[PDB]
Amino acid sequence: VVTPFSRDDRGHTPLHVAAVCGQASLIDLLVSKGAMVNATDYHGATPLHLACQKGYQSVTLLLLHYKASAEVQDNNGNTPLHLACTYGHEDCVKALVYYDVESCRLDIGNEKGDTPLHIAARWGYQGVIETLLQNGASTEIQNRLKETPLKCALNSKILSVMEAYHLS
Amino acid sequence: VVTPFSRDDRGHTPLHVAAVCGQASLIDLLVSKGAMVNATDYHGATPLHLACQKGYQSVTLLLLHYKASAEVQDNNGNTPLHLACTYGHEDCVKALVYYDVESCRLDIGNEKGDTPLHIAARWGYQGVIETLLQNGASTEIQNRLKETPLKCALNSKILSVMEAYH
Amino acid sequence: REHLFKVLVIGELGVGKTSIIKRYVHQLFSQHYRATIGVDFALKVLNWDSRTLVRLQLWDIAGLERFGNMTRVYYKEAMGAFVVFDISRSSTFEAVLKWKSDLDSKVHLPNGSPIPAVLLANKCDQNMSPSQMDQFCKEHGFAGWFETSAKDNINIEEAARFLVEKMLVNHQ
Amino acid sequence: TREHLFKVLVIGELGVGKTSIIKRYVHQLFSQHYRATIGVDFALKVLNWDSRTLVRLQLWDIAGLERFGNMTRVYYKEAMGAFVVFDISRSSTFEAVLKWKSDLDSKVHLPNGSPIPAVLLANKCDQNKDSSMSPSQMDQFCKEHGFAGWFETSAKDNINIEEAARFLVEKMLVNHQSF
Ligand SMILES: Nc1nc2c(ncn2[C@@H]2O[C@H](COP(=O)(O)OP(=O)(O)CP(=O)(O)O)[C@@H](O)[C@H]2O)c(=O)[nH]1
Ligand SMILES: Nc1nc2c(ncn2[C@@H]2O[C@H](COP(=O)(O)OP(=O)(O)CP(=O)(O)O)[C@@H](O)[C@H]2O)c(=O)[nH]1
Ligand SMILES: [Mg+2]
Ligand SMILES: [Mg+2]
């Protein structure tokens, strides 16, 4: 039968492989057979991290269902939510923000001190930015280089979208 | 029971939606219930195009299995192979290049006259570039702006990888 | 005192689910149909009392998703649901009992009793008596029903409140 | 030169050596460093069978995980033959070959309706021998379960990979004179 604790030399379990392929029935099976959901690969990446970078919302939710943790940090200090913010997958960003009614933290800084809202401002993903703001994302909280999320905004458009909220 | 010909106002069938979600059992079901595999959305995009842009190799193969066409062009003249070359998904690029045991054509130009190898050189994806060259990708064929794929190479490193072959 | 309620919105495709939510939360409407992809989410905050704040997590569930294996995941620990159909399409009404089966067989309250469900007859601004709806609801375990239009903002507020009321009772 | 093109499956359990066998055969390289294959990988081998004949091998590298995932009907379709691989240093991976063999045969036939030629590979033969299986027993095994043949191989040291490839190409060229 399946050995769900099997590793390769980058620390990829089968459950990591299932995540990055989107194969959700595989996930069901692997979890059912023992697989460690918050297994970390050689650079600190959870299968949830892989789902949130590929943008598979289906898998992201299925993992969170099977009690994956969203607060795990990779070598770069990134949660899965950071990774979904850097690659703009708002469908995944939402799954994370809403899965748990004690909702995702949002103040967690990576190695560069960037919260998810910084990252979202940087690459200019508006829908993401909004979703985050709607759920309480701080606009002051200050990255390592002493920047706020406003500071990080791409253009005057995105900037003003954020300022909208700040004032409220 | 399911209506697989249903359209929204961008011309997305359920099979388009399944593709972009990676939900492969959905695809199986939809195809089984009638769904048009080479259905094109409002901007000329096949569900295979969506799979090859999201990079879902699983789905891209399952579509090809259910007889999707790889030579369909979107509003920008891109085949799914172009889209997989622009976003670097070599796992998908490979599926396309190897599915069919004849070829699959690598000379198809998009609106800008770019073949897949141009696009791969541009963004510098080495594994892609190689896979294409190994399966015959021409190095001369000239985009609209009169560029070759070599011309389009990112750096001297990639350039030489291509010159290796030619 | 703050509550937070996961509310499902479910029903067949094109039935109006996304537009109901978008109206309720951002007072907007489009005529343009963009199919929802998997599950969309929205947050409504409201001031029930001086004493009470409630917060609604609105889970917008693509009408396609009932032919996939993912509903057990979306539904889990839901505090209640809007089941939606399109008055202008009888087929979508027959569907509500599919969705209702799915729902009840996969989410219960803490008590073990089914979760409060409110039936929405949407698109009521276009072209089943009230006494029949009541019999229908009474037979199939809907708390209640409403003719709604996201286009014109009929009855969406009132439906929300009716359901919040039910769920606040259940928090006893 | 007539040109042939053969889809060849490479299958078997995880870490068993499939990718490295292919990488050796095609690029003469070996790494000790295990990178799990994700879904399906591909490679192309060209070879000069003689004066008159060129053959071209599409090598379908199939993650050992993929046998628990119902995508195998897709990968296998219209395959012209297969390497089934196990790790001489792990008896568990040998028990597995009959799983993979079942899967294969129940889902791909030749044009004739007969099963496709399958060659069993006992890989990592440069280490120490675990399956309790003499050469005369391998032959009985192959004979009983419809393998064309078997080979002890090492991608590490390039044992027997060439000879296995040829043995299989030979089988499949025979089958091209049956349709
Ligand atoms: N007249 C009228 N039209 C409506 C109303 N609500 C929605 N529509 C129209 O019906 C169409 C479908 O609405 P939508 O909210 O996308 O439906 P949906 O249930 O989310 C369909 P899916 O589940 O695939 O995402 C839209 O084009 C919308 O403008 C309404 O109350 N009245
Ligand atoms: N000594 C020795 N080691 C080998 C040989 N072939 C492979 N290995 C080692 O075994 C490990 C796994 O090899 P790999 O080819 O990646 O196995 P695989 O079947 O492709 C594993 P998967 O199917 O899960 O991708 C690697 O560390 C590799 O170096 C061999 O012939 N001899
Ligand atoms: Mg919708
Ligand atoms: Mg491999």
Side-chain angles (χ1 to χ4, degrees), chain C residues 63-83:
Chain C
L64 185 46
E65 274 311 324
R66 105 163 144 85
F67 303 97
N69 320 273
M70 276 302 285
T71 21
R72 171 100 48 181
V73 167
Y74 304 149
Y75 293 172
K76 146 179 233 210
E77 281 170 22
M79 278 307 300
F82 290 129
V83 178

Side-chain angles (χ1 to χ4, degrees), chain A residues 1-3 6-10 12-15 17-18 20-21 23 25-26 29-30, chain D residues 13-15 32-39 63 65-71 75 99:
Chain A
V1 187
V2 208
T3 69
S6 173
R7 294 271 180 167
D8 80 352
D9 284 348
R10 303 260 194 89
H12 291 308
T13 68
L15 181 64
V17 164
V20 87
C21 296
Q23 305 172 269
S25 334
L26 204 51
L29 168 76
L30 283 178
Chain D
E13 275 304 338
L14 58 109
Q32 271 294 333
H33 184 259
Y34 175 27
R35 308 262 303 107
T37 294
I38 298 160
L65 185 45
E66 273 311 324
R67 113 169 137 82
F68 303 95
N70 297 45
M71 272 301 283
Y75 304 150
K99 294 302 200 230

Side-chain angles (χ1 to χ4, degrees), chain D residues 32-153:
Chain D
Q32 271 294 333
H33 184 259
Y34 175 27
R35 308 262 303 107
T37 294
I38 298 160
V40 181
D41 201 14
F42 297 87
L44 182 63
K45 177 69 150 168
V46 141
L47 49 106
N48 290 112
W49 199 240
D50 55 25
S51 234
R52 191 250 198 77
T53 315
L54 193 98
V55 333
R56 238 182 204 86
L57 258 55
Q58 287 198 324
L59 289 160
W60 282 55
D61 185 352
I62 298 202
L65 185 45
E66 273 311 324
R67 113 169 137 82
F68 303 95
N70 297 45
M71 272 301 283
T72 21
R73 39 128 186 183
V74 167
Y75 304 150
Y76 292 170
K77 135 159 268 210
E78 281 171 20
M80 277 307 300
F83 289 128
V84 177
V85 194
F86 73 99
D87 174 2
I88 229 142
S89 309
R90 256 144 72 231
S91 1
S92 64
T93 63
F94 180 76
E95 281 174 24
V97 315
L98 296 178
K99 294 302 200 230
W100 283 102
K101 186 62 151 75
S102 274
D103 200 57
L104 181 71
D105 288 335
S106 77
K107 288 150 119 168
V108 176
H109 305 295
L110 287 157
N112 338 334
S114 25
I116 74 177
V119 167
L120 181 64
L121 299 187
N123 193 46
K124 292 184 205 204
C125 77
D126 63 277
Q127 325 181 299
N128 317 316
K129 321 313 209 186
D130 201 0
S131 89
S132 29
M133 283 260 151
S134 81
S136 42
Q137 278 156 346
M138 287 303 199
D139 292 331
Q140 177 49 45
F141 186 73
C142 289
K143 183 192 94 174
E144 181 169 336
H145 298 281
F147 292 94
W150 68 279
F151 282 87
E152 306 198 331
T153 65

Side-chain angles (χ1 to χ4, degrees), chain B residues 68-88:
Chain B
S69 161
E71 314 211 312
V72 170
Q73 290 169 301
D74 58 8
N75 59 354
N76 291 303
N78 291 326
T79 63
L81 181 63
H82 289 85
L83 288 177
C85 290
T86 6
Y87 298 64

Side-chain angles (χ1 to χ4, degrees), chain D residues 16-43:
Chain D
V16 120
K18 298 184 293 286
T19 291
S20 323
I21 289 152
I22 289 155
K23 183 162 89 190
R24 157 133 316 278
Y25 190 42
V26 169
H27 311 90
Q28 301 74 346
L29 286 131
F30 183 79
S31 191
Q32 271 294 333
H33 184 259
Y34 175 27
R35 308 262 303 107
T37 294
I38 298 160
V40 181
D41 201 14
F42 297 87

